[PDB]
Amino acid sequence: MANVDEAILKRVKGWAPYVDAKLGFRNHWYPVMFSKEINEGEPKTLKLLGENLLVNRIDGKLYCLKDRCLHRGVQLSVKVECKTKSTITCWYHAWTYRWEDGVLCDILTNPTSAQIGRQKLKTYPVQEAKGCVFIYLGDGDPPPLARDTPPNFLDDDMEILGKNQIIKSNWRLAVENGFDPSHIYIHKDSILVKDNDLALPLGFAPGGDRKQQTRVVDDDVVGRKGVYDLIGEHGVPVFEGTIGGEVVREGAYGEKIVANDISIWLPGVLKVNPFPNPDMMQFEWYVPIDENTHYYFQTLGKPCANDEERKKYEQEFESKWKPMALEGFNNDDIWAREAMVDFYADDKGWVNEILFESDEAIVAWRKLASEHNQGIQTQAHVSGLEHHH
Amino acid sequence: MANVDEAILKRVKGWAPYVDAKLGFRNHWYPVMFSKEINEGEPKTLKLLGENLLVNRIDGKLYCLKDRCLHRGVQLSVKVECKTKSTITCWYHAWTYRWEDGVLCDILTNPTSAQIGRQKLKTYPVQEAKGCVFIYLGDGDPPPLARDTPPNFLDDDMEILGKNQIIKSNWRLAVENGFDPSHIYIHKDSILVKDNDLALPLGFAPGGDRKQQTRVVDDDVVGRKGVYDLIGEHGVPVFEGTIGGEVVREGAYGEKIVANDISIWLPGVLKVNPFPNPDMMQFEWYVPIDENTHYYFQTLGKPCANDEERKKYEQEFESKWKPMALEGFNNDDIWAREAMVDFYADDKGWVNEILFESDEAIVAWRKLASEHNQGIQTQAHVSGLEHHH
Amino acid sequence: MANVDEAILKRVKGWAPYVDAKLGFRNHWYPVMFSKEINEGEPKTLKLLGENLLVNRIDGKLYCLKDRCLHRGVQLSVKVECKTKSTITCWYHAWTYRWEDGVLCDILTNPTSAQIGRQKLKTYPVQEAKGCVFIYLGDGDPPPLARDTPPNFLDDDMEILGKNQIIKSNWRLAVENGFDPSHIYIHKDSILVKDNDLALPLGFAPGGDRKQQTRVVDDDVVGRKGVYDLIGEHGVPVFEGTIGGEVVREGAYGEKIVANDISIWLPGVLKVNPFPNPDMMQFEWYVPIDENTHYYFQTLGKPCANDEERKKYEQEFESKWKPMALEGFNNDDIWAREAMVDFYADDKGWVNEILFESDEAIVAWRKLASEHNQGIQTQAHVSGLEHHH
Ligand code: FES
Ligand code: FES
Ligand code: FES
Ligand SMILES: [Fe+2]
Ligand SMILES: [Fe+2]
Ligand SMILES: [Fe+2]
C-alpha cells in the first residue's frame, strides 16, 4: 500500500496493486533456502520482503523469528546467544525470547522487569517440503502450502533438486522475464540448446484472439492462482529471423521438444514442462528480498519411484542439468533482468514501455497478480507498528 | 526547465535559466570523441546531456541512435547485434531499427507484429569536423556547426589535435573556471610556465568601468554567442603578491606573451589565443554528461599549409604540447573544478558565493548563457515522453 | 532546529529538542584532538558538528578558522598556502585571511579589490587543557571550559592521557550506550574483567522509586549540567542470569570494585569513577562530526603529584590501560553503537523502541539534554547564512 507515486498508480488503472507491490505480496509462502543448508542449533539470518529474519532448527523442526530486538531494535544476529535449546538471548541487554512463540520469557539483566512475559517478538510459520524451506511471510493462520506452489511440485514421487542465489533486480522484472514468450530469443546461443539437441524457435507469430493467448486459472481446487502461456496453440513458431526479407538468424532444429507448457503462479513462481529434458520439469521462484533484489530459487523436478532412481537423478543433476541448464541456460535470464532495472527504477517504465503481441501473457499476469494477491507489503510492515501513535 | 528549487531560481533573477541548466543546454552541437576513435561497423556508447546514445560508422558516415529500446527500455548496447549493415537488433526480443532514421523495420521474434514500421527510435544529427565528432543533442533541423564553435576553429588551414576525458564536476563549474580571469593564480607553478618561458601574472588590477571588462558578442554573422575577457585593456597585471605590504610571491617574467585573447561561447567552449605558444590556439569544451560530470574536450590548433607542416605539428603535439600544456598546465584546472563541487551541490553556491571584480567576466557569461541558450535540458527529456499521459 | 520530521518531534513531547539534535548541540566546547597532534605551523583539518574547520598553532597558540573560502566556497585545505605566519591564502584566487580574527586582509590576485578588509571568515575559540584541544563550536564569547567538562577533569594534579578515533554512528547512540546501566552485559567477556580481577554484575534489579534512580545535577557552581546513575543505591546487582529458572550465565566475582560512580554531562561526556582501576577515572566524549559519525574521545585520568608519577602512569597507560581497557573493554561499545544505527536511522527508533526499568537513566539524560543544551545545530548553520536572502 502506497509504495509508488499515486499519480503513477492512477495511470496504470487495473495493474495498480501489482505496480504498487514493489516489496512483494504479503501473506504468501516463499522458499528461502534448502533444508540441507540449516542444521540443528545453527541459526541462519536472511531478509524476506524487506524484513530481517532468523531461522533455527530445534529438535529437527524449523522456527522463524523477526531478527530485531524489541528493546533498542538491534539485530539479535549481530552476536547470537542461544543459552537454552528453546530460546535466544539478545547480546545487548539479554532480553530473552522463545523460538516457539516469540514471547519475552526472561531478561538476564533484570529478572524483575515488568516487561517479562508482557512482550512478544513477531514469528512466522516455516515449513519444509521437497527439501525446500518455505516461510509464510504473513499474519494469522497460514493457508496450505499447496496454494502457493505450482501444480505437481508437491507430488509424492516428484524428486526436487535445486540452486538458490541473490540477484540484483526487483522481483517483478524476474517474473516477467520468466513468463515472457518472446524472450526465448536471448537463449538462442545457450549451450543447452546444442548439447541437449533442443528444438528452439526464435519467437512466435500469434494466432487467434486475445483471450486465446492465455488461460487464467482462478478455479483451482487448492486455491492456486496463475496463468498459462498458450501462444503456441494458435500461433506459428518463428525459426527464421529476417531483416528486410533476408534471413539473418535461424532457430534451433533439435529433436527434443520442451517447454510446451508454461505457467506463472502467485506469489511468483514459474513452471516449465517439460524442461530442460522431455522427462523433467522446472519450478523457479523470484522471491522479494527488498525492492532491488530477489532470491532466484531454481528447482528441477523428476519423478522417481525408488531410492535408486533418486540417487541417479541427483548424479545427473550435479554433472549435467545444474551446470548446463540452471546455469548454462538461465544465466542469460539474470543479466536480462538486470538490464531492465534502469527503465523501471523510477516506477515510470510501467507507463513508458511499449508492449507488443506476445506481451499479452505478461499483461494477463499483471492483472491476475493485481486481483488475487493476498496483500501488499509496505514499509510500514517493515519498520513495524508504532508506539504511542 | 525546473531542475532547481523554484525558490533558488527566484533569488538569482537574471541567471535563472543558467542556474536551472544543471543538465546542459538542449539544441546545441557538442563534441564527444575524436573521429579516429570510431571505426567502420564498430558501435560506441556514450552519455550526453544525461541521454545514453549509440554511434556507428557505416560506409564511412556517422549515425546516432538513442541507446534505449522502445520495448522494455533496455540499452541495446548490453549486447550489440548488428545483423545487417543498415540496422541494429535489440538483444532481448529482436526489435530491429534502422541507423539512418531509427525506424522499427522488423521484429525477429514476430515478423507479423503490428508495431513494425509504426514506431521510431530517437536519432540525433552527427557531424565530423577537424577530426572531431559532434552530436546535435536537439530536435528538428540542426543549425550550422559554426554557430556552436569558436571563431577560427573551422578555418581550412587550422590543424586540430586534442585529448578528451571524463571529469567529475558539473559542466558549469568547468566553464566558469576556464573563463575566470583571476584563476590564473593556480597556474603559477605550472611546468609550462618555466619550460616554455611564459610571461604569466598572478592576477589583475581592473581599470575602467564595468561594461569595459568584457565584450558580449551577439551580432556574429554565423550566429555565435559569446563573451571576450577584456580585463587587460584597462587593468594592470599583478606580478607581485603582497600580504601586509610584504612581497610573498611573484608572477612569471618569461618572454613569450600568451592568452591575451580569451573568449567563452555557447554551448560552453573556451578559446584562448595565442596559447600555449604564440603561434597556437586552444579550444576546449566542457560537455555535459550528467549533472555531476562532463567531458573535458581539449583541442590545440595551429595553421598548417601542407602535409609536411601538419606532420611536424602532430609530432610536437605528442612530444611537447600534450604533456606540457594540456596536461602540465590544465591538470590544475581539473582539481580546481572538483573543489567547487560541494559548495554548488545543493544549488545554493549560486546565491551564497561572494564575487569580486574579475568575476564580472563570469557574470557576463551567466547572463549571455541565460539569454541565448537554445533550450534547457530536463529529466523529462531524459526519461522520455510518457504514454497514455 | 528542524532536523527531524515535525510529526516525529510531536510524538516525543519532552525530548523534542534532543531528538531534533541530530547534528549536535551548538554553543558548547568539544575536544577534537590531543595537543601533541598539532605542531607549530602545521595546519590540520577536521569536521565538527558538520562544519569543516582548520586549526593551526602559531607562536604556540591555537587558532581555528572555517575551512571554506568566502569567494567560491572551496576548502582552503585542498592546497594550504600559509605565506606569512599570521595568515592563510586561498589557493584559488589568493583571498588572504588572518588566523587571529578571520579578516580578509589581502587578495594577491587583486590588491585593489573593494572586498579587502570588508569580509571576514568565521572563527571559533580554541583552548588546550590537560593536553586536549577543545573547540567552542558556537557564537559570541565562550563560557568557561569547566561548564562543559565533568567534575575533576580539570583538577591540577589530574593527569590525563587518551585516545581518539572516528566511529560510524550518530553521537547520541554513543552517549546512551555509555550511560546505559544494563549494557554492562556486553562487557561480561572483556579481557579487562579477568586480567584486572574486576567485580562485574550482569545487570541490576532496580529498587526504590523512579526519582531515586538518578540525580539530575543542574545546580553545579560552574554551570555543569548532567545526570548520575544511582541504580545501585536501592537496586541489587544481578550476578546470576537465569532462563526458566536455570542459571545459564554468571557475572564476574573479582576483588576490584569499580564504576560505582557514573555520570553523563552536556554536551555529551561520560565520567566513570573509579575505572578501569580503583585509583583511576575515565572521561569520554562522543563528539558530533556529522549526523552519521562521531569522535570517540577517550581519556583516563589519575592524580599525580610529581613528574615521576606522571612518567610511570604514562608507561602503565601505554602498556596496560590503553590496550586492556580503552580497547579491550570499550571496543565492544563500538559495535554496539553501530548495531543501533539502522533502527534510529529513519528517526523512528525514538518512538518505536520499548524501554524498560534501567533506561530511566537514559530518559533522565534525554530530558536534561533537551532542557539545558545551548542550541540545536542545523543545516543552516552548516551551509552558512545566505546572501540577498
Ligand atoms: S537491544 Fe536487545 S536486550 Fe536491549
Ligand atoms: S527490450 Fe528490446 S526488443 Fe524487447
Ligand atoms: S575560492 Fe578562494 S580566493 Fe577564490
Ligand atoms: Fe529465459
Ligand atoms: Fe586554468
Ligand atoms: Fe560499555
CATH value at residue C53: 2.20.25.680
Nearest of A191, A177, A171, A169 to residue A23 by alpha carbon: A171
Show Cβ contacts of residue C345 under 8 Å, excluding neighbours closer than 6 positions: none
The phi-psi region of residue C96 (left if phi > 0; otherwise alpha if psi is between -120 and 50; otherwise beta) is beta
Chain B residue with Cα closest to A344:
B73
Of the three residues C121, C154, C187, the one that is the final residue of a domain is C121
Contact (CB<8Å) C72/B349: yes
Q: Go through A33-49 and write b for each residue having 16 or more CB atoms within 10 A of its CB, e for each that does not.
A: bbeeebeeeebbebbbb
On whether residue B389 sits in a domain, the answer given is: no
Q: What residues 343-382 of chain B have any CB closer than 8 A to a CB of chain C?
A: 343-344, 346, 348-349, 351-358
CA–CA separation, C43 vs C60, rounded Å?
13
All residues at 6 or more sequence positions from B211 whose CB lies less than 8 Å from its CB, including other chains: none
Whether residue C302 sits in one domain with residue C170: yes
The verdict on residue C389 lying in a domain is no
Domain shared by C79 and C167, yes or no: no
Residue C255 makes CB contacts below 8 A (sequence gap 6+) with C197, C199
Mutate to test the interface with C, among B352, B353, B355, B360 (most CBs of C within 10 A): B352
- Give me the phi and psi of A9, to 5 degrees please: -55, -35
Whether A49 and A152 map to the same domain: the answer is: no
- C323: preceding bond cis by omega (within 30 degrees): no
Q: DSSP of C305-330, one letter per residue?
A: SSHHHHHHHHHHIIIIIIIIIIITTT
The rounded Å distance from CA A334 to ligand 4 centre is 8
Residues of C in contact with A91 (CB under 8 A): 185-186
Question: Which grid cell is C325?
Answer: 581497557
Nearest to C351 among A84, A89, A387 (CB): A387
Residues A90 and A50 reside in one and the same domain: no
Element (H, E) at B223: none
Q: Which residues contact A262 (CB under 8 A, 6 or more apart)?
A: A179, A181, A228, A229, A270, A271, A272, A273
CB A295 within 8 A of CB A284: no
Taking alpha carbons only, the member of C103, C96, C76, C65 closest to residue B203 is C96
Sheet holding C61-66, edge to edge: C44-48, C51-58, C61-66
B:95-154 residues touching chain A, CB 8 A cutoff: 96, 105-115, 119
Beta bridge partners of C231: none
Lookup result for grid cell 569580486: B356
* Cβ contact, residue pair A74, C358, below 8 Å: no
List the alpha helices (DSSP H) in chain B: 6-11, 16-20, 171-179, 191-195, 231-234, 307-316, 331-345, 349-352, 360-372, 379-383
| Same structural domain, C36 and C151 | no
For residues A350, A356, A360 and A361, what is the CA-based torsion angle, rounded to 10 degrees? -80
Nearest ligand, CA of residue A184? 4
Torsion sign, CA atoms A335, A341, A342, A348: positive
Tell me if B249 and C108 make a contact (CB, 8 A cut-off).
yes
Please state, in angstroms and rounded to a whole number, the distance separating the CA atoms of residues A31 and A122: 19
Report the CATH number that the domain containing residue B271 is assigned in CATH. 3.90.380.10
CATH number at residue C85: 2.20.25.10
B93 lines ligand 2 (CB under 6 A): yes
| CA dihedral over C378, C379, C385, C389, signed as positive or negative | negative
Same domain? C36 vs C9: no
| Collapsed DSSP state (helix, strand, coil) of residue B287 | strand
Q: Cβ(A97) to ligand 1 under 6 A?
A: no
Length of chain B: 389
Sign of CA dihedral C142, C148, C151, C153: negative
C-beta atoms of A356 and B105 within 8 A? no
Q: Is B69 in the pocket of ligand 2 (CB under 6 A)?
A: yes
- Alpha carbon separation from B1 to A158, A324, A376, B124 (Å, rounded): 60, 52, 36, 21
Same domain, A104 and A166: no
Quote the CA–CA distance of A382 and C343 in Å, as a whole number.
Answer: 11
Annotated binding-site residues of C for Fe(3+) read 183, 187, 333
Q: Which of residues 223-282 of C touch A (CB under 8 A)?
A: 238, 241-244, 246, 248-249
The amino acid sitting at B318 is: E
Name residues with Cβ closer than 5 Å to ligand 6, which is an ion. C 333
What residues contact residue B94 under an 8 Å CB cut-off, 6+ apart? A182, A185, A202, A203, A241, B81, B107, B108, B109
Domain final residue pick, C112, C139, C166: C139
Are the beta carbons of B218 and B240 closer than 8 angstroms? no
A130 with A147, same domain: the answer is no
Same domain, C134 and C175: no
Is A389 part of any domain?
no
Q: Is B103 helix (H, G, I), strand (E, B) or coil?
A: strand
Provide the grid cell at C141: 564569547
Both B369 and B249 in one domain: the answer is: yes
User: Does the distance separating the beta carbons of A108 and C202 come in below 8 Å?
Assistant: yes
Q: Would you say A200 and A188 are in contact if contact means Cβ atoms under 8 Å apart?
A: yes
Domain holding B58, by residue range, is: 27-66+122-139
Beta-strand relationship, C269-273 and A252-253? unpaired
Tell me which chain A residues have a C-beta less than 8 angstroms from the C-beta of C186: 91-92
Q: Are A287 and A31 in contact (CB under 8 A)?
A: yes
In this structure, the answer to whether residues C308 and C354 fall within a common structural domain is: yes
- How many C-beta atoms lie closer than 10 Å to residue C84's C-beta? 17
The secondary structure element, H or E, covering residue A247 is strand A246-250
Cα–Cα distance for residue pair B348/B342, rounded to 1 Å: 10
Per the rule left: phi > 0, alpha: psi between -120 and 50, beta: everything else, C249 is beta
User: Which residues of B contribute to the annotated binding site?
Assistant: 69, 71-72, 90, 93, 95, 100, 183, 187, 197, 253, 333
Both A183 and A313 in one domain: the answer is yes
Ligand closest to Cα of B104 equals: 2
Tell me if B366 is assigned to some domain: yes
Which strands, in side-by-side order, build the sheet including A158-167?
Answer: A158-167, A293-303, A281-290, A269-273, A261-265, A226-229, A214-217
A187 is in an annotated binding site: yes
Going by the annotation, the residues of the binding site of C are 69, 71-72, 90, 93, 95, 100, 183, 187, 197, 253, 333
Helix (H) or strand (E) holding A114: none
The C-alpha cell 595537543 sits at: C35
Q: How was this structure determined?
A: X-ray
Whose Cα sits closest to atom 4 in ligand 2?
A: B93
> In sequence order, which residues have a C-beta less than 8 Å from that of residue C158 and are 6 or more positions away?
C130, C152, C281, C301, C302, C303
Q: Say how many domains are in chain C.
A: 3
- Protein residues placing their CB within 5 Å of the ion ligand 5: B 333
Residues in contact with ligand 3 by the CB-under-6-Å rule are C 69, 71-72, 74, 90, 92-95
